[PDB]
Assembly symmetry: C4
Homo-oligomer: 92 residues x 4
């Protein structure tokens, strides 16, 4: 549980560092600085406008942007679910 | 204890809707103008429908730290709702 | 499980009958006929644009529309989750 | 059997993306123009992001029965994904 939350924080910072670098100059409102990146990736993780709102606009400049976001969604959504289940299981 | 979980959620929902009415009511009246409008918006935000693009990003354009309220709200309420729904299903199977 | 799926089908038809009647004349693209209603309520159940896309526009004509949709979401989302868990538990 | 579940999902994803490319490719080329565009749209539809307002409702304006493909697709894939993720967590706890 504590290790799961630690893994998620590491992945969140590494991904937000990568995203700032990859799409920061082209998409500054969403990935302009580490803070803007951490906010966008949290939004993308919850799945709110991930494609129509973020990825489809991003792919119009970077056609492979899906190689970053789709694996990010698969990894973080599974981890978040696994973490929440882990909290409930340990408390019981 | 299921009933206590639902009670905790109702308290958190009213406290948050009181806080939100005060924080964003004057600037964003269609969404947080009164306690009722606030309770509706926070239910929407809790389900995750247009939470960012639709609500938080427009709210952050006036209040840049609005994320300090909404992100912890989402983390707390979504976990509690999940925990509550699991608790109902687990207790009904045992009984 | 079979009874859960049966309860959901009854609730889906009753709600789509109610919705056709309540918002059919005012919102015909979404609730014009039982079919359009069953499609909208399935969308609302999955939570896609339930508020900004459907309920907020509907509330502008019917200010209490939330008394129908919010309890509908609470009932159907819980039942769907309970049904899917029930399938997985019975198969194991 | 986890590995078989992931295998079933991949088969369903390719079959559905083949079917969708054929059905809506000429009418909706930005979303279903090629197998790649189709696999991306169906992943989006599977996560439920703008599935109706963004994709299906525009698609139904040309193909009124499009719901016969997408609604069963959502029911099948979302259940399988949930079942797969639960299967991973259950097997890791047992081992
Ligand atoms: C799961 C973990 C998710 C963490 C999410 C962190 C979000 C941080 C967002 C943020 O702070 N900003 C980007 C907004 O998108 C910047 C501004 O809103 C504002 O904070 C600044 O101007 C200054 O106040 C900094 O001191
Ligand atoms: C635990 C979930 C609790 C959800 C509570 C939803 C409250 C709905 C609030 C409401 O009635 N309105 C706000 C929507 O504008 C409309 C009124 O102002 C008029 O009827
Ligand atoms: C969980 C259960 C969810 C059931 C969902 C059922 C959706 C039915 C939607 C539907 O069929 N239509 C509304 C579209 O919103 C009508 C048209 O698309 C079209 O079917 C008709 O014109 C004729 O073909 C009828 O024979
Ligand atoms: C099991 C989930 C599988 C998801 C598979 C996503 C495939 C992404 C498809 C893709 O590469 N593009 C489609 C997006 O337009 C862009 C290309 O056409 C160019 O690079
Ligand atoms: Na969702
Ligand atoms: Na959603
Ligand atoms: Na949306």
């Amino acid at each position: 549980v504590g290790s799961v939350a630690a893994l998620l924080t590491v992945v969140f910072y590494i991904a937000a560092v990568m995203a700032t670098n990859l799409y920061g100059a082209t998409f500054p409102e969403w990935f302009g600085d580490l803070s803007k990146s951490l906010y966008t990736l949290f939004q993308v993780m919850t799945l709110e406008s991930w494609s129509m709102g973020i990825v489809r606009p991003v792919m119009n400049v970077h056609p492979n942007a899906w190689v970053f976001f789709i694996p990010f969604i698969m990894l973080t959504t599974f981890t978040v679910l696994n973490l929440f289940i882990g909290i409930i299981v340990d408390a019981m």
